[model samples]
Target: MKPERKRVSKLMAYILRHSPEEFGLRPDVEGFVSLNELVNALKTVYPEVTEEFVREIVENDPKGRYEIRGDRIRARYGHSFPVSLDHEEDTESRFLYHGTPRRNLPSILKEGLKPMKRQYVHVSTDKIEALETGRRHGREVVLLVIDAECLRKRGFKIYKAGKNVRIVERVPPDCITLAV
Candidate 1:
């Protein structure tokens, strides 16, 4: 489970950019995920990849480098993996660390995530951080939050779901035209 930094960074980038289908992986194989699965998936995608190479990467990085576990990954790190969504260049956006005690957000943001604007956030015990983060940020932010969860759950598995995708895609790209 302990992965090196180089591999961690590479794997993190790959996971962030590409879905599982990109690897031609199966959806339901108790196939939640593990470091080993990640290695295997990487090998499938990049035939040149080796276990030793992966080990080196895992070894070098010790921080929250790779997400190689299923369930409670957020609990483990005290925050969900941050998936960035592009917006207008001037868009002012931030991530609020919910399910986190007031005192903890500062340290978590400092150590876990890069610097960004933060507002004092409140979260209900019943709702996840994604929801809380969305509620504070707005409807669009909430959509991203749900999208993130879907990506985390289905991963590339939904690719097998065919064109249907069963993937949320709930939020559409909406554009509002203004009268000039």
Candidate 2:
């Protein structure tokens, strides 16, 4: 990602995930917003933004964060506000990974992982990617292994948030084990 594109992508993430109303924009029940409206709204801060740039970011995003359908766009995951995304339920993996800083390990081990400010507790299908995510916040990364089969049998719902990301409402302490 180029510097300019990266900047635009962050702005788009803010608008689509955190606060669409900040720019006088409205997202539908499923979080879709008009691509043109998004571009124009973002122009208040980024004068260079255009529909083409938005399309470029949506199509080329490496993490599969954004989705485009016709003239509408929305962030696929990482939402802080309320919007029920139409994600397909997946149960192929027997386990999923949640990575966090070692500093957070003790508490998480005791009480389990919570979404905190975000809507759902984000997990990664790829362990390496989970480690990378953990390293972003601290040096010593702790990966928590979640038993997906058990979670499903317990009636916990899991949704594929992105190509590498999965989400659940919460993960109880009993379901998590330290990665060996």
Candidate 3:
């Protein structure tokens, strides 16, 4: 991603996932904001921002984080505010992984996984990706196994959030195990 596009992408995430109000924008309960309103609000920071620029970022983002419909847009996942995107329930994975910095492992192990500030606890498609996510915070990464099948059976829905991420409301301590 170009530096310009990367900047816009981060800004979009902040506006869509966390605080649209910070940008003088508002998103509906489903997290959709009008494309025109987004562009206008973004102009304060990114004078060059336009609907076309926003569309390009959405199309080229490697993470597939943003979704755009006719006249509105929203982050596909990783929301801090409550959002209910239309996602299919995942039932095939026997287990999933959550990765975090070593410093967080103690609390995580005891309490299981919580979303913290975000609305969902992010899990990954594979161990490697999970580790990578942890490594992004620091050199020491701890990977935890999630009992996906058990969670599914217990009525928690696992959602495929993006190409690289799965999400759930919460994971209980009994369903989390240390990676060997």
Candidate 4:
């Protein structure tokens, strides 16, 4: 039988939440791969997948799910960081993910991860549970965002809270030119 939309959407949500790394699907889950790339990958599995299908899945998968910025899609929950710690008012909080660095987790979680009822269709996709716990006890995560080709080099993957990986590269600031 063909997979139902809700089932497909839920599966997609699970894929996004755990990231490609968790499944060995990709090396740097927080690297240069675009959301379109991810969608394409998803299509490989579900040949019937279309742009609209991907959009809808991302839109309603929950977990504060992902965000769509211009032509890019990113995670809106479970991670975040600052572009620069140069100032306090640089509330230019980017979505949650790698390239967001490891030190700014606490600040971003406290400042940007706002709770709401309806989904912000423009940016935030679905309004699922944003499970942020590390920041509660002054804990933080770190991601050693290094050039993909230079994984063998020093400091590549980040280690946050000494328990989980704090890298959300899908998010803009965490994956864009804001840092460079």
After superposing candidate 1 on the true structure, give the runs of residues whose Cα lies further than 4 Å from its correct spot: 1-8, 16-18, 24-32, 67-180
Worst 10-residue lDDT window for candidate 1 reads 171-180
Clashing pairs in 3: none
Ranking by TM-score: 3, 2, 4, 1
TM-score for each of the candidates: 0.28, 0.58, 0.59, 0.36
Query: How does residue 42 of candidate 2 score in lDDT?
Result: 84
TM-score of structure candidate 4: 0.36
Model 1, 83-167: lDDT tens digits are: 2111111111111112333444445334432223211112111235444554554443221111223332433211111111122
Point to the candidate with the largest TM-score: 3
Residue 139, candidate 3: alpha-carbon lDDT: 67
lDDT of 4 by residue, 10-49 (tens): 5555554445443333322232225565667667667777
Q: Superposing every Cα of model 2 onto the true structure, what RMSD results?
A: 8.2
Error of 1 at 43 (Å): 2.0
Q: Quote model 1's TM-score.
A: 0.28
lDDT of 1 at 159: 19
Per residue, candidate 2 scores C-alpha lDDT tens digits across 1-180 of 499999989999999999887787767546788998898988988898889988989889999989999999999988875564885676798889988898989999988887664445778888999889889889789888999887788787887765778777778888899984
Query: What's the residue-level lDDT of 54 in candidate 2?
Result: 89
